[PDB]
């Protein structure tokens, strides 16, 4: 019964795990888009 309560809590825990993984993925996406912007800026500087 405590394990069933753990399952009920773990549904929210995995939801929090997914939210934190989504936050990490968005951080990775922010880093990647900023890297793409830096690549565009370096490409413009290389064109100059």
């Amino acid at each position: 019964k405590l394990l069933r309560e753990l399952n009920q809590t773990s549904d929210l825990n995995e939801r929090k795990m997914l939210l934190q993984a989504k936050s990490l993925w968005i951080d990775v996406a922010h880093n990647t888009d900023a890297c793409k912007n830096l690549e565009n800026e370096i490409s413009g500087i290389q064109q100059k």
């Binding site: 795990m17 990490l24 951080d27």
Partner: protein
């Protein structure tokens, strides 16, 4: 009444939050410094909850 005037901020109370230096301070021509390893979030650790998910 008194509560509204105390809560509200007079525009004259500060010097319009004036900045330091007459003009903006100069910067390096590139000065990228990407950093941004963490954007908000943080707080509860991911490793412990990942082991909990496993």
């Amino acid at each position: 009444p008194i509560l509204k005037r105390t809560i509200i901020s007079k525009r004259k109370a500060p010097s319009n939050n004036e900045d330091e230096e007459i003009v903006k301070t100069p910067r390096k021509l590139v000065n990228y410094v990407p950093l941004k390893i963490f954007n908000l979030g943080d707080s509860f650790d991911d490793t412990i909850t990942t082991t909990v998910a496993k």
